[PDB]
């Protein structure tokens, strides 16, 4: 057992392994079984370059006994920091064969975040392309090493210049020692705020689970072209269905430069993908661009939107502007995955967040006493299940304050339930504003926001006030000629919105900070908001 690992309770790890969920299989079994059924099959395509199944599980067993040579041993964390390119996947099978244990860091991540990663996981190897999205990445690497100097194994998919090419160690397969369906395949990062994620211990029964559920509610098959627009390295584009789930599924993984409708379109239209996952504040320039471009994006039959919450007023055009399913998608990289059916009517498709994936799946909608909510009634959102973690990497207290002592991992969402058990969620607990003595849910503001025809995009946060102790400030992106502060308020007046709910303040950006994956951070903007204020 990797030290630091939480263990899933004896009896449920055996209900579960006797119901079927874990499959007992690992990632290098399901890649040596894919291979040897469809090896011609394209698995991965980036630009003018393929990858069928056997060429992959070709190059991982020659790298895997190049890591091996190169003195990496089973057990060993790997920070694995590379874009959507292709070395991902021969990368981590073959760690995956290997018995050592990637760590998934993200494009954005900087000197900070991955000198944290390599101390914290006491990392045998770093990872990198020589430069992605005009960022050279060897930069990045001295720095680390700088501070890191027992890091002595730097490797670069590219142009490694003093550090270790990726390339040059491809070897002669070998032996590998067991790899067991039990043991942490590898590390995910949480998503929260404050910096310095947690990480998340993920075996390959459990994730393989995900992996499994996601195709089944996905549909995906030996037809799927997926397209990878977001930093796939993230657990929504890694295993929602993802490349994974794809992978899993036999189908094909279109790898995109960047998440941009430029990059992404051409490749939708040449390739024929046909589905793609996006965050909200990316859907709104995708629906944008699909209004304003010529590409054929027709080949599309499910839009995936996911990470935060994907409005009602935005949602409801997908069908219109895309011409293809939307599919809500509420997961989070500690284990849990909601999704809107295929198969589902409109409004539950516009309306909610999805249900859980899996029929083991355990929720629970408590009140600040944890004490379970009323039927239908709004709260603290708990869950427990296959594929959800029972606590973080050697992180003991956090641990206490994020897991009841019986076994649910709080989430950290404020939602509620629907009456077939779909999830509508709020938000973040951390994202509710408490003006004056008042809660406000910030996205039911940003929804009224999005019906205003010069609003792009809409993030309501608080900020502070000595007298309320909280107001509210809403970041809006203007569709062209900003409209005045005004105005917007007096539409949401017009509307009735609740005059508490209506922002104390508007301010207008051409753009809002986002996280690794994407998303709108909430906590950068109230940051922003509270320095303005302190400014004077
Ligand atoms: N669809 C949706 N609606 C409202 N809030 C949502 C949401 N999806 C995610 N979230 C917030 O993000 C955390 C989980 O953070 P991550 O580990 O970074 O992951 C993901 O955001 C994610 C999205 C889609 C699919 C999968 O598998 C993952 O992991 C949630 O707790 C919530 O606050």
Same mark, same amino acid.
């Given at each position: 057992?990797?030290?630091?690992?939480?263990?899933?309770?004896?009896?449920?790890?055996?209900?579960?392994?006797?119901?079927?969920?874990?499959?007992?299989?690992?990632?290098?079994?399901?890649?040596?079984?894919?291979?040897?059924?469809?090896?011609?099959?394209?698995?991965?395509?980036?630009?003018?370059?393929?990858?069928?199944?056997?060429?992959?599980?070709?190059?991982?067993?020659?790298?895997?006994?190049?890591?091996?040579?190169?003195?990496?041993?089973?057990?060993?964390?790997?920070?694995?920091?590379?874009?959507?390119?292709?070395?991902?996947?021969?990368?981590?099978?073959?760690?995956?064969?290997? =018995?050592?244990?990637?760590?998934?860091?993200?494009?954005?991540?900087?000197?900070?975040?991955?000198?944290?990663?390599?101390?914290?996981?006491?990392?045998?190897?770093?990872?990198?392309?020589?430069?992605?999205? =005009?960022?050279?990445?060897?930069?990045?690497?001295?720095?680390?090493?700088?501070?890191?100097?027992?890091?002595?194994?730097?490797?670069?998919?590219?142009?490694?210049?003093?550090?270790?090419?990726?390339?040059?160690? #491809?070897?002669?397969?070998?032996?590998?020692?067991?790899?067991?369906?039990?043991?942490?395949?590898?590390?995910?990062?949480?998503?929260?705020?404050?910096?310095?994620?947690?990480?998340?211990?993920?075996?390959?029964?459990?994730?393989?689970?995900?992996?499994?559920?996601?195709?089944?509610?996905?549909?995906?098959?030996?037809?799927?072209?997926?397209?990878?627009?977001?930093?796939?390295? #993230?657990?929504?584009?890694?295993?929602?269905?993802?490349?994974?789930?794809?992978?899993?599924?036999? =189908?094909?993984?279109?790898?995109?430069?960047?998440?941009?409708?430029?990059?992404?379109?051409?490749?939708?239209?040449?390739?024929?993908?046909?589905?793609?996952?996006?965050?909200?504040?990316?859907?709104?320039?995708?629906?944008?661009?699909?209004?304003?471009?010529?590409?054929?994006?027709?080949?599309?039959?499910?839009?995936?939107?996911?990470?935060?919450?994907?409005?009602?007023?935005?949602?409801?055009?997908?069908?219109?502007?895309?011409?293809?399913?939307?599919?809500?998608?509420?997961?989070?990289?500690?284990?849990?995955?909601?999704?809107?059916?295929?198969?589902?009517?409109?409004?539950?498709?516009?309306?909610?967040?999805?249900?859980?994936?899996?029929?083991?799946?355990?929720?629970?909608?408590?009140?600040?006493?944890?004490?379970?909510?009323?039927?239908?009634?709004?709260?603290?959102?708990?869950?427990?299940?296959?594929?959800?973690?029972?606590?973080?990497?050697?992180?003991?207290? #956090?641990?206490?304050?994020?897991?009841?002592?019986?076994?649910?991992?709080?989430?950290?969402?404020?939602?509620?339930?629907?009456?077939?058990?779909?999830?509508?969620?709020?938000?973040?607990?951390?994202?509710?504003?408490?003006?004056?003595?008042?809660?406000?849910?910030?996205?039911?503001?940003?929804?009224?926001?999005?019906?205003?025809?010069?609003?792009?995009?809409?993030?309501?946060?608080?900020?502070?006030?000595?007298?309320?102790?909280?107001?509210?400030?809403?970041?809006?992106?203007?569709?062209?000629?900003?409209?005045?502060?005004?105005?917007?308020?007096?539409?949401?007046?017009?509307?009735?919105?609740?005059?508490?709910?209506?922002?104390?303040?508007?301010?207008?950006?051409?753009?809002?900070?986002?996280?690794?994956?994407?998303?709108?951070?909430?906590?950068?903007?109230?940051?922003?908001?509270?320095?303005?204020?302190?400014?004077?």
């Amino acid at each position: 057992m990797l030290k630091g690992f939480t263990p899933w309770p004896d009896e449920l790890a055996e209900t579960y392994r006797k119901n079927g969920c874990w499959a007992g299989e690992t990632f290098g079994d399901l890649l040596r079984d894919r291979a040897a059924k469809y090896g011609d099959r394209i698995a991965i395509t980036c630009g003018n370059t393929h990858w069928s199944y056997r060429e992959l599980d070709t190059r991982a067993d020659r790298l895997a006994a190049g890591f091996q040579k190169l003195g990496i041993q089973q057990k060993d964390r790997v920070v694995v920091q590379l874009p959507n390119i292709k070395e991902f996947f021969e990368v981590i099978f073959a760690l995956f064969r290997l =018995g050592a244990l990637p760590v998934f860091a993200l494009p954005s991540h900087r000197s900070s975040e991955i000198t944290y990663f390599c101390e914290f996981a006491e990392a045998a190897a770093y990872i990198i392309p020589d430069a992605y999205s =005009g960022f050279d990445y060897r930069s990045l690497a001295r720095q680390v090493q700088s501070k890191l100097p027992t890091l002595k194994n730097i490797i670069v998919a590219g142009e490694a210049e003093e550090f270790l090419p990726l390339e040059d160690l #491809h070897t002669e397969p070998v032996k590998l020692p067991e790899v067991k369906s039990s043991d942490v395949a590898f590390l995910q990062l949480s998503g929260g705020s404050t910096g310095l994620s947690k990480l998340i211990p993920r075996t390959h029964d459990d994730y393989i689970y995900s992996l499994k559920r996601s195709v089944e509610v996905c549909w995906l098959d030996h037809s799927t072209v997926y397209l990878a627009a977001l930093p796939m390295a #993230h657990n929504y584009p890694l295993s929602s269905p993802g490349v994974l789930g794809v992978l899993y599924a036999g =189908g094909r993984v279109v790898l995109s430069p960047s998440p941009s409708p430029d990059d992404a379109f051409p490749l939708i239209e040449r390739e024929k993908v046909t589905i793609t996952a996006l965050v909200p504040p990316l859907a709104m320039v995708w629906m944008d661009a699909a209004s304003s471009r010529r590409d054929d994006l027709s080949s599309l039959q499910v839009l995936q939107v996911g990470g935060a919450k994907f409005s009602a007023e935005a949602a409801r055009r997908v069908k219109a502007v895309f011409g293809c399913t939307l599919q809500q998608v509420f997961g989070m990289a500690e284990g849990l995955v909601n999704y809107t059916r295929l198969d589902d009517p409109e409004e539950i498709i516009v309306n909610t967040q999805g249900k859980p994936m899996s029929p083991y799946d355990e929720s629970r909608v408590w009140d600040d006493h944890d004490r379970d909510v009323k039927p239908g009634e709004t709260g603290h959102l708990l869950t427990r299940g296959p594929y959800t973690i029972r606590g973080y990497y050697k992180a003991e207290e #956090h641990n206490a304050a994020s897991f009841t002592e019986d076994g649910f991992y709080r989430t950290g969402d404020i939602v509620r339930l629907t009456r077939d058990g779909y999830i509508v969620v709020e938000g973040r607990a951390k994202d509710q504003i408490n003006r004056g003595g008042e809660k406000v849910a910030a996205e039911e503001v940003e929804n009224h926001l999005l019906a205003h025809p010069a609003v792009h995009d809409a993030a309501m946060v608080s900020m502070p006030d000595q007298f309320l102790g909280e107001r509210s400030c809403v970041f809006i992106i203007p569709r062209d000629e900003a409209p005045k502060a005004a105005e917007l308020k007096a539409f949401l007046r017009e509307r009735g919105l609740a005059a508490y709910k209506i922002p104390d303040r508007v301010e207008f950006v051409e753009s809002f900070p986002q996280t690794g994956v994407g998303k709108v951070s909430k906590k950068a903007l109230r940051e922003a908001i509270s320095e303005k204020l302190l400014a004077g």
